[PDB]
Design a protein around this ligand. Structure first.
Ligand code: DND
Ligand code: DND
Ligand code: ONL
Ligand code: ONL
Ligand code: ONL
Lengths: 651, 339, 657
């Protein structure tokens, strides 16, 4: 049905921020540069191309802006670019000084397929320090109605929206430079009114620290407004009478940098990026206070003129111009990952500390298998007790038998907790014979482990620490009730499996426990990293897409297939030797995804529904029915399986 | 004149339906809705009100925010709309729908191949067992239009649906909690000229809650000189934390016309013939009704009026109404004794 | 420090609805009646006295209302009422035809301690059937400003509020008869604006069916507005030229009837009642859609004028003119209780049915002890299976003896019964754990108890896995409330809990109801009867802890409020009503000391100790309008909190005996 490989068909929109070569006072030369860059955007299958402030005239020309021949030439060049846009795909947004009523305004001219769609005046004209804009130009705020551009009255003003009738997640607002620097930017209101993609044309002469100011405000704009922010500054060609120009271009999306270009380039540059319109749709759907803010400013947000146009974007394979991280829960950037780990660890630990204070410092009872989960849980328990001034011997670690085991006893001893072994085999057998008895034997044991721990907890003034992690909660990979699903407080509940290993190796690298302790933990890593329905790399990927954005299955398959299909494309996080770096085909992704939707939406909720306490960890979510995930325990996943059948190719 | 025609005598055949909900499965909800609407059509009915969030299931919590859920809701809606081309009654069907930034708790009014309007729930309970503001936006103060499969249809809380060939039939829709607030959307709608008030309800069943539904639906109808048509969710809604009784009922000016079995096994319909002339006549005589309108002129004059033609049956289709032999002498013994 | 026995000090307000003797055309005489009834209200410590429409003239005097001497007589009778109210405690609300600008208005004069607070014209004048009010009277809808009464300009119009300054939960709004019959009543907007007590003055000539109409609309107003509604109609003395009067008076609170007087009385009558202003406060506090409605009509609601007065109510013991039931979950009225039970039962059954449909009809594993709870859950599970067309033998019931009723019921029902002796496994576990009992020591501590409790659950869960079933929860709401259960492995844990939303006090009555319906038959009836007759005294009487549960769960009332209520309900066994099924013997009274003691235990256990077991709760339906305790639903709280402030409120506010 759908062309699976089409970014557009997956709700992406391609955008370009362009920096052209300026020829100050020569609009025909500026236009030829623009047209050439636009032709490259067209070839890239871009929906949108933003150029710098006053593109057609040059920003830096001062009183030359007031010359009849300057203004006339600007107009003629403009008409030719509109004629030339008949055969171009993208909306072009080009800056121009245009006469309207008494003055010239600093405008962006929004151009698509042989017509001008609208003309947006700069709202705020800096008349301070190096800037002199009120001398030549009129402010645009409050101006409405229309402007005559080549025998056509087109919308004119700061209340304008350019909505694609065939791509409803793409709604464009345009503002100009200084417009984003003021306490109440025009783009803020345009976001509340429906704009999803915010364009900024800049001149912006460059100064020590100014690129940092542009970033601060483009970034936070994109985050606070749940939007893409597309930004172009002026470059080479501009006058250096008093200023210099760096040509910076950048594309932001909900606080995250999608693309940015070389500063001080020799020649023209572009940022091109695929903006995920569903990601924006998803954040807005969920943050109700965004809409609350709209209704508060209802008169202000309801008067925008919506201007429709049809994009007819390309339907075929044009690749994906986007970084798609293999591990949404594990950033491939080392400094970023180090920070993620520091926070995850301190979250779990402080989550436990409070519990423990509240219970007047119980013993901590914990089943330890030599596994990644219970190991890391033990560390957390230990640091918590240390921080609270509590004897590590009040941690009661139990091996509960019915290889990896050796690690458990080593770590316990290395840390100096209280270690003990209870053999559950005979209770297991008594139970099995009483019941009238593979699968079965394993349930009885897992159950009895929990049973003993809970009873030991009763006996010794303790609480049972849970050890199951987020990925297991997600998939229903636990024994429910009397089983490892149950505890008094679960420290690993909000930590996905893909992140646990990284957390342990963070603790090792911190090395604040012993050198002895580091050795046993490294051993755990080596023994353990070498639950069989899916690689957790894949199921944690899908978990993120669902928990955070509620994305559809085919949308998930596409992103994962882009992140995972080629082993040597994109980045990997640290602690991955080149022989532990796998590929997954679409068929693989599709298979594991079918299992995912079935187990996540239908099978597993009842287990999450009666969940012990524990802290949320990841911006991506947790799975607490008191927090991030309210769902029925009694629902089919037919809908999602059906979506897979119809939308995702078998190979 | 066809003497034996209920329609020609100023009656409107109205139906409140409780379907079988399959949570998170819109196509199956649309199947249960379509089946029941054909039954209504056969009965010569002019209106079929279904439960809150008919197409999704009311009780699915954050599954409401899942993209595949919403896509399937919309595809099911479009198919329902397509099927009504041949169906006599106006269908009033709940759906979670995207508009602007959020999803709304909506009722979609469907007649003969087209959508007539889309009505957001005004007040979203977010207390006790209700969590509606977490997933859904308030509809109060919303106007303008909404894009439903290639048409821009009216969207908002100020809509009236008037049968151009049956003037006593003027339809207003509100949703569950909308009738429980001091100043219901429907009280203003009646002053504006609505004679038939629909309510789609989710309404998890609790000890006493049917008495509450009763009191407010009956007192609404009496206070507003209207028929009031109520339909609650039943079997199929998630029982993770709640139970559902699928109550449906039809009031007219304080009188109960029809009601269905609570906790039924299977689908149930209340069906009743509303005397629009009764309503007309009480309105004509009670001047203080219209005085109240004039006091809230701006409120009541702003309502938008969508016209449709019913083309109801001409013939003898019986009369789904209890007409007492002695208007002055109640047949019910307890009531007669009170009198 | 408070006077614990003062209803005023617990957030009550005493309201009175009065019907007086009409002498038509004779205000001095209507005044004299009013005054006499006002003094009786004062004596009763009432803060409000509402009289019938046009109290001072007679409602039915028609064009006599246009007579100069009538109008003059009225005005002088009012000024005299006002002078007398100097020494009266209640706000008086009194009907009168009054001259303002070009006309006479059908007004309500709100009077208090020697001053008029405000005059409220009838918004809406019926001029149809037997009513002709537009002929003599002008509409009040949307008039404002002031009116001169006895040398004072006083608020006049339909947007007035009388807010008591020493009684913040008493804010009065007044309307008049037909005002409450129109789609958009004056008083609906005034409730949004902040009125807690809605007064209505009626003439209301009586007619077949009309008293039901008054009730339908005053009751639903009180319900929809989260308000008290105080209603008074004219009776004897009105003109019977074309009409008759029944002098009906009534007080509604939030949809409930507080009081009502005799219809067609010989002589004057009053409904006096204590309105709980905290019940109203708590209800408003929780239904945010009420506030959402106010913000939607912000212009309407913010326009209101607020007039203050110091009520200065009596500080002492003046009783409680209120019916406080012993069992908030168990209505004393037997047809009401029959209704609750029908509903409880069908809620439990349908909830479980849906669970079973959803899992393609698993087997049903249930631990049966012969107790009330498990007995009831078995019955519920049997009905679920029947309704779904599933064999009763797919219920797998287990007696689990540790260190007759169940087996008899199981066999009578025709379910699959089995005994599993947990003793040997308990022994083995206690030894493995090194418990003193495994070496002979009679240490019957929590672990000893829990090892057994836990093993019962462990067994059932493994049966469930082995046999393709689900374990039914058996614990009831009162146990969830107190944490009287074994957490995690044990008791507290199941695949689906049918009794989760049902409090203990309600359970026996459900069984009674099952026997009465007779649907299961003679033998089942008999065994169930037997279970009732054969069938934790350190958490206190469940009757007391359910009383406390309701106040906290529904209203969040402070502890001294709950003590007050419980004491009033439970102090004297011979006073008030009991539900069906309490033989005279089975009828305890509780002292303040008893009530206080168990409340201390409630707050500690409920707010502090027990939340953690509630926090990881299996699925099950909510049952009671009082609330349920699911952490995904009615009760969201921390698992790590102390109850210090509640225990401290008890020390300061509740006398020790
Ligand atoms: N919607 C629903 N509502 C209420 N109950 C429902 C239910 N769906 C199934 N059930 C019931 O719940 C039970 C099924 O749940 P459960 O008892 O968990 O059993 P189940 O999920 O079938 O098995 C869990 C499996 O995962 C693996 N596991 C287990 C324990 C720990 C780990 C680990 O992380 O190391 C892995 C192991 O292979 C084990 O057999 C049955 O009694 C079934 O009847
Ligand atoms: N806030 C908190 N967060 C996490 N864990 C917490 C905790 N507070 C205590 N804990 C832990 O939980 C455990 C205490 O809870 P739990 O295991 O329930 O033990 P506990 O509540 O101390 O005792 C249960 C008691 O309830 C009574 N009961 C139970 C079952 C049935 C019946 C009947 O009459 O039929 C009566 C009986 O007297 C029994 O001994 C301890 O291990 C404690 O450390
Ligand atoms: C974008 C622009 O007009 C230059 C930057 C602005 N004046 C600023 O405040 O930094
Ligand atoms: C929706 C309805 O009509 C009755 C239930 C409602 N949610 C309530 O009682 O609060
Ligand atoms: C006093 C009054 O308005 C009663 C008339 C009312 N419409 C009624 O009882 O029907």
């Amino acid at each position: 049905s759908m062309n699976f490989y089409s970014a557009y068909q997956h709700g992406f929109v391609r955008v370009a921020a362009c920096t052209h070569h300026t020829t100050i006072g020569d609009p025909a030369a500026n236009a030829a540069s623009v047209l050439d860059m636009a032709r490259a955007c067209h070839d890239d299958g871009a929906a949108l191309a933003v150029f710098p402030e006053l593109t057609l005239s040059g920003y830096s020309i001062e009183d030359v802006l007031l010359q009849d021949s300057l203004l006339d030439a600007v107009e003629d060049a403009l008409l030719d670019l509109v004629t030339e846009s008949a055969d171009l795909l993208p909306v072009l947004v080009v800056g121009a000084p245009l006469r309207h009523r008494h003055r010239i305004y600093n405008t962006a001219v929004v151009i698509h397929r042989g017509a001008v769609l609208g003309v947006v005046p700069k709202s705020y004209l800096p008349t301070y320090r190096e800037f002199y804009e009120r001398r030549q130009m009129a402010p645009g705020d409050g101006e409405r109605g229309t402007i005559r551009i080549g025998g056509a009255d087109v919308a004119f003003g700061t209340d304008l929206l350019f909505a694609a009738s065939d791509l409803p997640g793409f709604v464009l607002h345009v503002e100009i430079c200084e417009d984003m620097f003021v306490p109440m930017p025009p783009s803020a209101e345009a976001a509340l009114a429906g704009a999803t993609v915010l364009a900024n044309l800049s001149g912006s002469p460059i100064t020590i620290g100014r690129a940092e100011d542009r970033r601060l405000l483009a970034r936070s704009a994109s985050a606070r407004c749940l939007a893409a922010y597309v930004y172009a500054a002026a470059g080479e060609g501009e006058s250096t009478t008093d200023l210099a120009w760096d040509g910076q271009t950048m594309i932001w999306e909900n606080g995250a940098l999608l693309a940015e270009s070389e500063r001080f380039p020799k020649g023209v540059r572009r940022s091109v990026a695929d903006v995920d319109t569903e990601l924006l749709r998803s954040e807005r759907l969920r943050m109700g206070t965004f809409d609350d803010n709209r209704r508060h400013h209802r008169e202000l947000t309801e008067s925008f003129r919506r201007i429709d146009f049809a994009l007819d974007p390309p339907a075929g394979d044009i690749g994906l111009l986007r970084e798609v991280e293999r591990f949404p829960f594990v950033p491939a950037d080392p400094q970023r990952l180090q920070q993620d780990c520091y926070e995850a660890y301190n979250i779990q630990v402080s989550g436990l500390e409070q519990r423990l204070r509240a219970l007047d410092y119980p013993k901590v009872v914990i089943g330890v298998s030599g596994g990644l989960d219970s190991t890391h849980a033990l560390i957390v328990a230990t640091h918590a007790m240390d921080r609270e001034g509590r004897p590590r011997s009040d941690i009661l670690a139990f091996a509960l038998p019915g290889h990896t085991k050796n690690n458990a006893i080593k770590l316990a001893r290395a840390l100096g907790v209280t270690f003990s072994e209870i053999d559950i085999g005979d209770t297991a057998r008594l139970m099995l014979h009483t019941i009238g008895h593979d699968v079965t034997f394993e349930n009885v044991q897992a159950g009895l482990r929990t049973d003993y721990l809970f009873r030991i907890a009763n006996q010794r003034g303790g609480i049972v620490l849970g050890t199951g992690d987020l990925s297991e909660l997600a998939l229903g990979w636990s024994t429910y009730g009397v089983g490892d699903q149950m505890s008094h407080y679960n420290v690993n509940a909000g930590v996905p499996k893909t992140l646990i290993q990284h957390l342990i190796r963070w603790v090792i690298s911190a090395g604040e426990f012993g050198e002895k302790v580091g050795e046993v933990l490294q051993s755990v890593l080596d023994t353990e990293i070498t639950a069989k329905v899916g690689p957790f790399a894949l199921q944690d990927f899908s978990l993120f897409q669902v928990l955070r954005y509620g994305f559809r299955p085919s949308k998930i398959a596409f992103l994962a297939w882009h992140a995972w299909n080629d082993a040597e494309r994109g980045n990997w996080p640290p602690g991955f030797p080149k022989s532990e770096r796998p590929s997954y085909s679409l068929a693989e992704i599709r298979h594991w995804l079918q299992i995912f939707v079935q187990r996540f939406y239908s099978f597993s909720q009842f287990k999450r529904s009666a969940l012990p306490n524990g802290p949320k960890v990841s911006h991506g979510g947790a799975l607490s029915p008191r927090g991030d995930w309210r769902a029925p325990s009694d629902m089919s996943a037919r809908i999602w399986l059906d979506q897979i059948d119809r939308e995702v190719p078998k190979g």
